[PDB]
Design an enzyme around this catalytic site. Structure first.
Site, short mmCIF file in Angstrom:
data_model
loop_
_atom_site.label_atom_id
_atom_site.label_comp_id
_atom_site.label_asym_id
_atom_site.label_seq_id
_atom_site.Cartn_x
_atom_site.Cartn_y
_atom_site.Cartn_z
CG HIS B 151 26.49 4.82 1.21
ND1 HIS B 151 25.58 3.80 1.02
CD2 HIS B 151 26.73 4.87 2.54
CE1 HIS B 151 25.29 3.26 2.18
NE2 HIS B 151 25.98 3.89 3.12
ZN LIG Z 1 24.01 5.69 6.66
#
Ligand SMILES: [Zn+2]
Lengths: 34, 383, 48, 62, 90
Positions: B151
């Site tokens: 992320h």
């Molecule tokens: Zn995740």
């Protein structure tokens, strides 16, 4: 009578607790080695 | 119609095939806490490693320690100022770093904790050393459960992931490979790796995530790529409570088609533990065996593969599925008993190697699956 | 509704009884006594 | 044939690292064996103390 | 000059051909405990072995003494330093 049977049962549960502690120690030692 | 539900076959592994796996574990990885009330918990790697030690899997697998990634190596993706601030920041001097933290999207949803650079460097080094050993051809599988935090953007740390070691691992694989297929299983969309590799052909950033009201807000069927990377961004958005059988029926056709058309030389398979029942934020209902059938199918081809960790906001289920996958990687099936370890009392009241699905509204209607498979096949035939 | 609700469990009772019969507790979980015998106290366990 | 000076020095450094790791492992294993032992002894102490206290309380009530 | 690294001291000793054994690494130094004396490295690096090593402090002091003792002349070294700087690319 009642005192004797109470003492015997309490001793039985104490012995079971001690055996459980010994089993936990055995498992911990096996984990140590592994 | 392309999707076709089939009964879940039992786990089967080829006994003739021999696979070399180099598990990576840094003993200091599980000692940094994000905060008092933060879902992220790095302890799962340590518990999983303890499980693999206790199950006796060490006798059939190789395990090493990956040297921490240098700052210049870690800067192969992220900007210089981002890494500089990430190194310079401490939970005790952010008063003078307030503007930098505001710019870099850190502090409020992703907070600063001591040892942050150590954790980031450990994950990056694990990924880079796994990729380097993959290139050298000594080990067919390079398991790095520590990293997988996909992320992290180029200049922002969103979604509790400060450094994206998957990008660095893919880069060091690309230094000697033309095309590497990337597979995602995390419920959240892999925004970081997707954005990094959205304008290139040399990668296949296949994904299996969920579309709805979330933090990523990406992963549509429309996004397929720009430039030479057009139609090279395979996304399969899904919905609540996808069970084992339908997840397998979605995964196996798509992966088979990718391997038949894309023909990669190495696989960077994400194995996020937040796609399981009982997760803190993950809405899926996949069981551990369903979580491992995908890995077994990927392994059955017989090509070098780099398995990484990633998300997973719970500990016991994530550790259980990770050790089960590690065992399955050795063509060995792990029994349901979880042999005693220092962290045995964590593993619920069942004390069995299994995560069990819950009853959730299976919004994943077969029509949606057929439509998404048809779209994926249409955009995949162009490769 | 009653018929279908009962059938949805009658169709898989054949395998559920086998799963219950084959269940075996691990030797080293009874020591931690997390296995609540409340179902065993009231006989609610399906074993046997 | 491994006679190189720099390679030999690096091999010696790696063997020193291996031997220190083996020493640290043994020391930590002994320490946490001792920790398990003292915890087990304390558990037995508490169990016996609670046993005797329960017996005394039962006698007092009776 | 103990603030330097092991590689610098080893290369200094190799270049000047000093007769001083290679310094023991910090981890190698901490290895030598009571039980640490039973390992292969310590049992093979303490007595009767020509490969014996010694602490980093003494080697650092020896190198510092040899470096301060070794006088220099600008004419011999400055052109050599410039040539090495302009040669490192090749
Ligand atoms: Zn995740």
């Amino acid at each position: 009578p009642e005192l004797q049977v109470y003492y015997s049962k309490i001793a039985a549960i104490r012995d079971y607790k001690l055996h459980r502690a010994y089993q936990r120690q055995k498992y911990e030692l096996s984990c140590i080695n592994t | 119609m392309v999707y076709e539900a089939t009964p879940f076959d039992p786990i089967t592994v080829k006994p003739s095939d021999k696979r070399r796996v180099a598990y990576f574990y840094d003993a200091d990885v599980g000692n940094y806490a994000y905060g008092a009330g933060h879902p992220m918990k790095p302890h799962r790697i340590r518990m999983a490693h303890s499980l693999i030690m206790n199950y006796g899997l060490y006798k059939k697998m190789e395990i090493y320690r990956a040297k921490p990634a240098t700052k210049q190596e870690m800067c192969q993706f992220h900007t210089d100022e981002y890494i500089d601030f990430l190194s310079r920041v401490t939970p005790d001097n952010l008063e003078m770093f307030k503007r930098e933290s505001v710019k870099f999207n850190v502090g409020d949803d992703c907070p600063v904790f001591d040892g942050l650079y150590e954790y980031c460097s450990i994950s990056g080094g694990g990924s880079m050393e796994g990729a380097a050993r993959l290139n050298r051809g000594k080990c067919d599988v390079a398991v790095n459960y520590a990293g997988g935090l996909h992320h992290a953007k180029k200049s922002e740390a969103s979604g509790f992931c400060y450094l994206n070691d998957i990008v660095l691992g893919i880069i060091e694989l690309l230094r000697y490979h033309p095309r590497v297929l990337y597979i995602d299983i995390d419920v959240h969309h892999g925004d970081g790796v997707e954005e990094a590799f959205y304008t290139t052909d040399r990668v296949m950033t296949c994904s299996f995530h969920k579309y709805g009201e979330f933090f990523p807000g990406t992963g549509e069927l429309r996004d397929i790529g720009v430039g030479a990377g057009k139609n090279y961004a395979v996304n399969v958005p899904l919905r609540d409570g996808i069970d084992d059988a339908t997840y397998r029926s979605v995964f196996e056709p798509v992966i088979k088609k990718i391997m038949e058309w894309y023909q990669p030389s190495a696989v960077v398979l994400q194995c996020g533990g937040d796609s399981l029942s009982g997760d803190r934020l993950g809405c899926f209902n996949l069981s551990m065996e369903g979580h491992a059938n995908c890995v077994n199918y990927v392994k059955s081809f017989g090509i070098p593969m780099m398995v990484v960790g990633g998300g997973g906001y719970t500990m016991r289920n994530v550790a259980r599925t990770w050790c089960f996958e590690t065992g399955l990687l050795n063509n060995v099936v792990l029994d349901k008993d979880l042999p005693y370890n220092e962290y045995y009392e964590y593993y619920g009241p069942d004390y069995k190697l299994s995560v069990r699905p819950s009853n959730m509204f299976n919004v994943n209607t077969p029509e949606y699956l057929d439509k998404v498979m048809t779209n994926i096949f249409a955009n995949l035939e162009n490769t | 509704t009653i018929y279908e609700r009962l059938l949805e469990i009658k169709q898989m009772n054949e395998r559920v009884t086998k799963e219950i019969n084959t269940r075996s507790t691990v030797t080293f979980a009874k020591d931690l006594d997390l296995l609540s015998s409340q179902l065993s106290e009231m006989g609610l366990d399906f074993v046997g | 044939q491994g006679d190189n000076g720099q390679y030999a020095r690096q091999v010696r450094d790696l063997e020193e690292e291996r031997d220190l790791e083996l020493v640290r492992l043994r020391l930590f294993e002994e320490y946490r064996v001792s920790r398990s032992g003292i915890e087990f002894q304390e558990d037995i102490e508490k169990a016996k103390a609670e046993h005797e206290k329960l017996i005394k309380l039962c006698k007092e009530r009776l | 000059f103990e603030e330097y690294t092991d590689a610098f001291l080893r290369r200094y000793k190799d270049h000047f051909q000093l007769d001083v054994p290679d310094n023991l690494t910090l981890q190698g130094y901490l290895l030598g405990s009571k039980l640490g004396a039973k390992t292969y490295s310590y049992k093979r690096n303490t007595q009767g072995q020509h490969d014996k090593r010694i602490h980093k402090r003494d080697l650092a002091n020896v190198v510092r003494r040899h470096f301060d003792e070794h006088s220099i002349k600008e004419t011999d070294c400055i052109p050599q330093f410039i040539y090495k700087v302009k040669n490192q690319k090749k």
